[PDB]
Design a protein around this ligand. Structure first.
Ligand code: S4M
Ligand code: S4M
Lengths: 281, 281
């Protein structure tokens, strides 16, 4: 049996590898290389341009935290946007909220969605929900053109190398600010505290220009580089995203595997070296 | 440049790899294979029987949490024991406490200590402290024979395969119970929540037989399998280890890089799937 190994200039000198049970699908789309394999121990794995995007084993950790953090803080969110997230994990978690009336997803690469609908049916099940509307477009353009404003924007991008290059900058955060309701929240995938501290500082810097409350949370997920990933949390009001305003008690949330009321605030309690770095920003 | 790759039956189907800048030292001791290399991005790395034991880049995360969790809860600890920990990282953190009068370390493999004193001088600096007493012995035997009792016992073992095989069982926890003061605390390296849940359940089960309060905390550290490791926290009193009884404010602790007052309790806020597994124990 062969092994898949994740190398990158974005994390030099380290690599994570998974043993391949069988390759399921491979293609070069208009935007990126796409690879799906069944691993021996992490279940099915999606790889985009050589970078692990999700595995069946741990995906719930990232999708639950990215979704339930802003969604438990927002009082009665009705319109939510997902940027990226073609796999549909975020959308799957959003559909659990009965108050939600509309979910827009803006994904540049329709191949990602189609591959997820075929190979990852427990991740892409949300696409069946009548509230979901799909836009195949660069989020950069979608955000300049959208007429609606959103209660919550979730930025579930890949890394700065590739199609997500348009999403890591100051103009992007302006567009997010403008696409949000007066009391709206954005959460965005932000890199690992263990390797990307200069980037975290940059992103916080861009966000603080516009948002009156910028916070950073960390998630444990073994198949992302360094075994964790951050959430850049941006608020328009003074109160921020560290404290949920509700508990997820109904039957739709019985099955949650990572998120809970106490984990929410705990994820914002960062290692001392990081707080030190992001103080004079 | 070549790469070091960490494979193991203890974490099947996955591997973490670091690029080697240069090999520094290699030997087969009486107990295990020892390897020291300079990595390209994680600094110097100690490997025992093919398993990464520490790197310069992230070691502080494990050593600070393992030490400062029990040491901030214990009111005035005077006598502390370290089981394993031949590198001296725990001892380095213990020496910061002026109230401490004695630190015993029981390490089976003197080669580990000697290699750390040569190659890892910023980790093994604590050995110079007059309060430190070294016993080259199986902790299993040391704990049967010791006459003193300790305020805190820190079990900084390697994995269940190798010399640390004697340290993962019910009789071991009895010996820890007996070596502790009436109001004493033990913390012990416990595996990753992402792979070893049956083991975590076993260890908690053994501990709850004897200790009136057994808790589990998680630490983020990129060079351990799955990017995290747990602390099995055992207490003889009703109150447990989740809340510090002091803040580390003096000049000795100015330099801490991971631990802080709020991180302490946050580390005990576990993902929902794990709480679910460890409820009916
Ligand atoms: C698969 S998802 C990663 C974790 C799964 N929740 C990353 C998605 O972001 C899309 N992406 C990347 N750049 C953009 C832009 N610019 N716009 C929209 N979507 C994008 C990319 O095609 C992946 O499908
Ligand atoms: C290097 S340390 C790992 C992380 C660094 N704080 C693990 C040490 O535990 C020792 N060890 C393993 N088994 C035992 C027993 N049974 N007794 C004492 N020390 C042990 C082993 O030799 C390593 O040096």
């Amino acid at each position: 049996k062969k092994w898949f190994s994740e190398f990158s200039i974005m994390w030099p000198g380290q690599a994570f590898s998974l043993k391949i049970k069988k390759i399921l699908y491979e293609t070069k789309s208009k935007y990126q290389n796409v690879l799906v394999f069944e691993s021996t121990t992490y279940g099915k794995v999606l790889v985009l341009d050589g970078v692990i995007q999700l595995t069946e084993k741990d995906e719930f950790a990232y999708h639950e935290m990215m979704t339930h953090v802003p969604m438990t803080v927002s009082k009665e969110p009705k319109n939510v946007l997902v940027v990226g997230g073609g796999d549909g994990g975020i959308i799957r978690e959003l559909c659990k909220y009965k108050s939600v009336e509309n979910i827009d997803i803006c994904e540049i690469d329709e191949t990602v969605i189609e591959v997820s609908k075929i190979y990852f049916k427990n991740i892409s099940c949300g696409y069946e929900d009548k509230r979901v509307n799909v836009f195949i477009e660069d989020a950069s353009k979608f955000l300049e053109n959208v007429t609606n404003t959103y209660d919550v924007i979730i930025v579930d991008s890949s890394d700065p190398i590739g199609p997500a290059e348009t999403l890591f900058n100051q103009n992007f955060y302006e567009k997010i600010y403008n696409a949000l309701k007066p009391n709206g929240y954005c959460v965005a995938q932000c890199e690992s505290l263990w390797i990307h501290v200069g980037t975290i500082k940059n992103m916080i810097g861009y966000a603080k220009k516009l948002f009156k409350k910028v916070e950073y949370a960390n998630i444990s997920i073994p198949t992302y580089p360094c075994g964790c990933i951050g959430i850049l949390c941006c608020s328009k009001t003074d109160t921020g995203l560290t404290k949920p305003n509700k508990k997820l008690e109904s039957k739709e949330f019985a099955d949650l595997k990572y998120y809970n009321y106490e984990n929410h605030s705990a994820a914002f309690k960062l290692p001392a070296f990081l707080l030190k770095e992001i103080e004079n920003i």
